[PDB]
Amino acid sequence: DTLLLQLTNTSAYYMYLLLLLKSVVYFAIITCCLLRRT
Amino acid sequence: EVQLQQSGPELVKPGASMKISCKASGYSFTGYTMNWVKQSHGKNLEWMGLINPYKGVSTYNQKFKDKATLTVDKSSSTAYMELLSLTSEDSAVYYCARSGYYGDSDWYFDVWGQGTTLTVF
Amino acid sequence: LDPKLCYLLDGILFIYGVILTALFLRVKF
Amino acid sequence: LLDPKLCYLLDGILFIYGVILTALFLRVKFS
Amino acid sequence: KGNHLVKVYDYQEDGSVLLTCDAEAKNITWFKDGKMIGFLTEDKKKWNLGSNAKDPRGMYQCKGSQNKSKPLQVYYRMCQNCIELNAATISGFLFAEIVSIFVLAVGVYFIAGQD
Amino acid sequence: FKIPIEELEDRVFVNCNTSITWVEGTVGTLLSDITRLDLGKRILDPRGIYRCNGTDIYKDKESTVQVHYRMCQSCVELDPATVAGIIVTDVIATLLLALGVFCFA
Amino acid sequence: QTPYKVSISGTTVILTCPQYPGSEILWQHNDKNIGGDEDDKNIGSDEDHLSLKEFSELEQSGYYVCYPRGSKPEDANFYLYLRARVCENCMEMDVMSVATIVIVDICITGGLLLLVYYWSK
Amino acid sequence: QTPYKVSISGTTVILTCPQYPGSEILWQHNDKNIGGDNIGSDEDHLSLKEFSELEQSGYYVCYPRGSKPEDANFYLYLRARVCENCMEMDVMSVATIVIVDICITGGLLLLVYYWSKN
Amino acid sequence: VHTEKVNMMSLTVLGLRMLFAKTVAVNFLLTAKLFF
Amino acid sequence: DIQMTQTTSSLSASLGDRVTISCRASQDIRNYLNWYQQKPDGTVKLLIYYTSRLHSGVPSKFSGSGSGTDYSLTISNLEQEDIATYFCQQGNTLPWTFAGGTKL
Ligand SMILES: CC(C)CCC[C@@H](C)[C@H]1CC[C@H]2[C@@H]3CC=C4C[C@@H](O)CC[C@]4(C)[C@H]3CC[C@]12C
Ligand SMILES: *[C@@H]1O[C@H](CO)[C@@H](O)[C@H](O)[C@H]1NC(C)=O
Ligand SMILES: *[C@@H]1O[C@H](CO)[C@@H](O)[C@H](O)[C@H]1NC(C)=O
Nearest to residue E4, comparing CAs of E76, E68, E66? Answer: E68
Amino acid at C29: F
Return the HEC string of C1-29: CHHHHHHHHHHHHHHHHHHHHHHHHHHHC
Range H86-91 contact pairs with CB under 8 angstroms and sequence separation of 24 or more = H86/A7, H86/E79, H86/E82, H86/E83, H86/E84, H86/E85, H86/H10, H87/E82, H87/E85, H88/E77, H88/E79, H88/E81, H88/E82, H89/A14, H89/E81, H89/E82, H89/E83
CATH number for the segment(s) J4-103:
2.60.40.10
After which residue numbers is chain E interrupted with C–N beyond 2.5 angstroms? none
After which residue numbers is chain J interrupted with C–N beyond 2.5 angstroms? none
Largest CA-CA distance found in chain F, in angstroms, rounded = 83
**CATH T-level topology, domain G5-82:** Immunoglobulin-like (2.60.40)
DSSP-assigned beta bridge partners for residue B6: B22
**Number of DSSP helices (H) and strands (E) in chain G, helices first:** 2, 9
DSSP state of A9: H
- Taking CA atoms, B114 is separated from B8, B117, G18, J40, J59, in Å, by 10, 10, 40, 12, 21
Between helices A2-37 and E87-114, what is the axis angle to 10°?
Answer: 10
Touching I: which chains, 3+ CB pairs < 8 A?
A, C, D, E, F, G
Please check whether residue B30 is in contact with residue G35, taking contact to mean a CB–CB distance below 8 angstroms: no
Compare CB distances from E92 to C4, C15, C18 and report the shortest one's residue. C4
Q: How many Å apart are CA E73 and CA E60, to the nearest integer?
A: 6
Burial of residue B24 (number of CB atoms within 10 Å: 0-12, 13-18, 19+): buried
Cβ atoms within 10 Å, residue G26: 26
Amino acid at G102: V
Q: Side-chain half-sphere of G111: how many Cα atoms within 13 Å?
A: 6
Residues of chain E contacting residue H8, judged by C-beta atoms under 8 Å apart: 77
Q: How many Å apart are CA H58 and CA H48, to the nearest integer?
A: 14
Best of I2, I14, I20 to substitute, by most chain A Cβ atoms within 10 angstroms, is I20
Report domain extents, chain H.
Answer: 1-87, 89-118
Please check whether residue B48 is in contact with residue B83, taking contact to mean a CB–CB distance below 8 angstroms: no
Please check whether residue H60 is in contact with residue H75, taking contact to mean a CB–CB distance below 8 angstroms: yes
Write the CB contacts of D16 (distance below 8 Å, at least 6 apart in sequence). Answer: none
Q: How many Å apart are CA H83 and CA G109, to the nearest integer?
A: 41
Report domain extents, chain B.
Answer: 3-100
Centre of ligand 1 to C-alpha C22, Å, is: 5
What was the resolution (in A) of this experimentally determined structure? 3.2
Cβ atoms within 10 Å, residue H111: 12
Q: Which helix (H) or strand (E) holds D19?
A: helix D5-28
Please check whether residue B49 is in contact with residue B84, taking contact to mean a CB–CB distance below 8 angstroms: no
Pairing of strands E30-32, J33-38: unpaired
Q: How many Å apart are CA E55 and CA E75, to the nearest integer?
A: 8
Burial of residue H11 (number of CB atoms within 10 Å: 0-12, 13-18, 19+): middle
Radius of gyration of chain B from its Cα atoms, rounded to whole angstroms: 13
- CB-based contact I4 G98, cutoff 8 Å: no
Compare CB distances from G90 to I4, I14, I22 and report the shortest one's residue. I4
Strand order in the sheet with E6-9: E6-9, E17-21, E47-50
**Number of DSSP helices (H) and strands (E) in chain F, helices first:** 1, 8
Q: Side-chain half-sphere of C2: how many Cα atoms within 13 Å?
A: 13
CA dihedral (A8, A13, A19, A23) positive or negative: positive
Q: How many Å apart are CA G54 and CA G10, to the nearest integer?
A: 9
Give me the phi and psi of E74, to 5 degrees please: -120, 125
Centre of ligand 2 to C-alpha I26, Å, is: 70
Report domain extents, chain J.
Answer: 4-103
Q: E6-45: string of b/e by CB count within 10 Å (b at 16+)? A: bbbeeeeebbbbebebebeeeebbbbeeeeeeeebeeeeb
- CB-based contact F86 I30, cutoff 8 Å: no
Best of A6, A8, A16, A26 to substitute, by most chain C Cβ atoms within 10 angstroms, is A8
Q: Is I13 helix (H, G, I), strand (E, B) or coil?
A: helix
DSSP-assigned beta bridge partners for residue H5: H16
Residues of chain H contacting residue E110, judged by C-beta atoms under 8 Å apart: 116
**Which residues span the domain enclosing E99?**
83-115
Q: Residue G10 — left, alpha, or beta (φ > 0 → left; ψ -120 to 50 → alpha)?
A: left
Amino acid at E44: K
Atom of ligand 1 at shortest range from CA of A23: 3
Q: Is I20 helix (H, G, I), strand (E, B) or coil?
A: helix
Radius of gyration of chain F from its Cα atoms, rounded to whole angstroms: 25
Report domain extents, chain D.
Answer: 1-31
> Quick one: how far is CA E12 from the chain centroid?
17
Please check whether residue B79 is in contact with residue B34, taking contact to mean a CB–CB distance below 8 angstroms: yes
Amino acid at F77: E
Q: How many Å apart are CA D12 and CA J26, to the nearest integer?
A: 76
Write the CB contacts of F15 (distance below 8 Å, at least 6 apart in sequence). Answer: F3, F4, F5, F6, F35, F36, F37
Q: Is F97 helix (H, G, I), strand (E, B) or coil?
A: helix
- Taking CA atoms, E101 is separated from A26, A29, B105, C14, E105, in Å, by 10, 14, 78, 14, 6
CATH code of residue E62: 2.60.40.10
Please check whether residue E55 is in contact with residue E22, taking contact to mean a CB–CB distance below 8 angstroms: no
Strand order in the sheet with J102-103: J53-54, J44-49, J33-38, J85-90, J102-103
CATH number for the segment(s) H1-87:
2.60.40.10
Nearest to residue A10, comparing CAs of E53, C5, E81, E52? Answer: E81
Please check whether residue J73 is in contact with residue J19, taking contact to mean a CB–CB distance below 8 angstroms: no
CATH number for the segment(s) B3-100:
2.60.40.10
Write the CB contacts of F80 (distance below 8 Å, at least 6 apart in sequence). Answer: G89
Cβ atoms within 10 Å, residue B63: 15
Give me the phi and psi of I12, to 5 degrees please: -70, -35
- Taking CA atoms, G105 is separated from D21, F95, G70, I22, in Å, by 21, 13, 54, 11
**Number of DSSP helices (H) and strands (E) in chain I, helices first:** 1, 0
Q: H29-48: string of b/e by CB count within 10 Å (b at 16+)? A: beeeebbeeebebeeebbeb
Q: Which helix (H) or strand (E) holds B118?
A: strand B116-118
In chain A the first and final C-alpha atoms are separated, in Å, by: 54
Domain count, chain E: 2
Q: Side-chain half-sphere of I29: how many Cα atoms within 13 Å?
A: 19
Q: What is the DSSP string of G23-55?
A: S-EEEEETTEEESSSSS-SSEEEETTEEEESS-
Pairing of strands B44-52, B32-40: antiparallel
Please check whether residue G66 is in contact with residue G34, taking contact to mean a CB–CB distance below 8 angstroms: no
Write the CB contacts of B42 (distance below 8 Å, at least 6 apart in sequence). Answer: none
DSSP-assigned beta bridge partners for residue J89: J34
Q: How many Å apart are CA E108 and CA A30, to the nearest integer?
A: 8
- Write down the H helix ranges in J1-104: none
Indicate whether E27 belongs to any domain: yes
Q: How far is C20 from chain A (nearest CA, A)?
A: 20
Q: How many Å apart are CA I12 and CA I6, to the nearest integer?
A: 10
Give me the phi and psi of G108, to 5 degrees please: -65, -40
